[PDB]
Structure 1
Amino acid sequence: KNRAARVRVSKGDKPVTYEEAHAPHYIAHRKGWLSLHTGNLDGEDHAAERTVEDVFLRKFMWGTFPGCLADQLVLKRRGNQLEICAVVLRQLSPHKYYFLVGYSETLLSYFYKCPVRLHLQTVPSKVVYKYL
């Protein structure tokens, strides 16, 4: 039986998001990609470098906004701009979100030598697609 990226059936009490509820064979069919760049197009270079950066940004944001992320990050690249779109919860005070936004954008801009921006969308709770 296949396992890769499959939330297995339970007793009907496990809430799953839309992304978590779709196995890998639905990528490009019912769900899009979590990162968009030109590295994987035919005749394009630097796919390896873009990949390492994406893996780091996901770990950085997970530990920088602990317990706040309500979904996976969406990483977008246009030119030399880097946009990070995250869906967060409404538990931390706004002051701490503004501190962490100013802190993370500045730190990542100096780390990867490019203008980085972080767009936050807050939700009252984790959006549930179904109960497995």
Structure 2
Amino acid sequence: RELPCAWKPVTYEEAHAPHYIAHRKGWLSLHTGNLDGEDHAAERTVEDVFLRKFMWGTFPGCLADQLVLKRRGNQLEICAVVLRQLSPHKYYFLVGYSETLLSYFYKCPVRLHLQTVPSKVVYKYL
């Protein structure tokens, strides 16, 4: 263009800035590690990193939004939001596959909670 001539849909998580994390947004992962006195916060962080990368590479172009990783006791719930573009048979295949891999990789009863949506739920435009 020209020098003084210079002088995108976003979901809720994308729209709101980091300084709203406890004001408007929430926390994607929920666990006891960061509480006072509790241990293994770093191990939970590393587990979260691996889960997010694995899920984004195992459901490519399906996840409409970011994961929600809940932990109760030794349970590990992945609440994901996906699109209605892939066939349900492939979704069932991938759910079973991912559940079994993550259970045998983290030695805990992992479980997965797909929620399909017709399309990205755009909050605003930035």
Q: TM-score, normalised by structure 1?
A: 0.90
Q: Could you list the runs of 5+ residues in structure 1 that have no partner in the other structure?
A: 1-7
Paired residues of 1:36 and 1:75 also in contact (CA < 8 A):
yes
Note closer, same or farther for the CA distance 1:125–1:37 as it changes in structure 2 (3 Å cut): same
- Give the Å deviation of 1:18: 0.3
Percent same amino acid among aligned pairs?
95
The 5 A counterparts of 1:50-129 are 50-129=44-123
* RMSD of aligned residue pairs (Cα, Å): 3.7
- Tell me which protein shows more helix as a share of its residues: 2
Paired residues of 1:12 and 1:131 also in contact (CA < 8 A):
no
- Give the Å deviation of 1:53: 0.2
Note closer, same or farther for the CA distance 1:12–1:127 as it changes in structure 2 (3 Å cut): farther
**For the pair shown, which has the larger CA radius of gyration, 1 or 2?**
2
Q: TM-score, normalised by structure 2?
A: 0.94
Secondary structure of 1:117 counterpart: strand
The size of the alignment, in residue pairs, is 125
2:14, 2:106 → 1: CA distance? 29
Following superposition, which runs of at least 4 residues in structure 1 exceed 3 angstroms of deviation?
8-13
What is the CA deviation profile of residues 20-47 of structure 1, one whole-angstrom value per residue up to 9, with x for unaligned ones? 0011110100010000000000000000
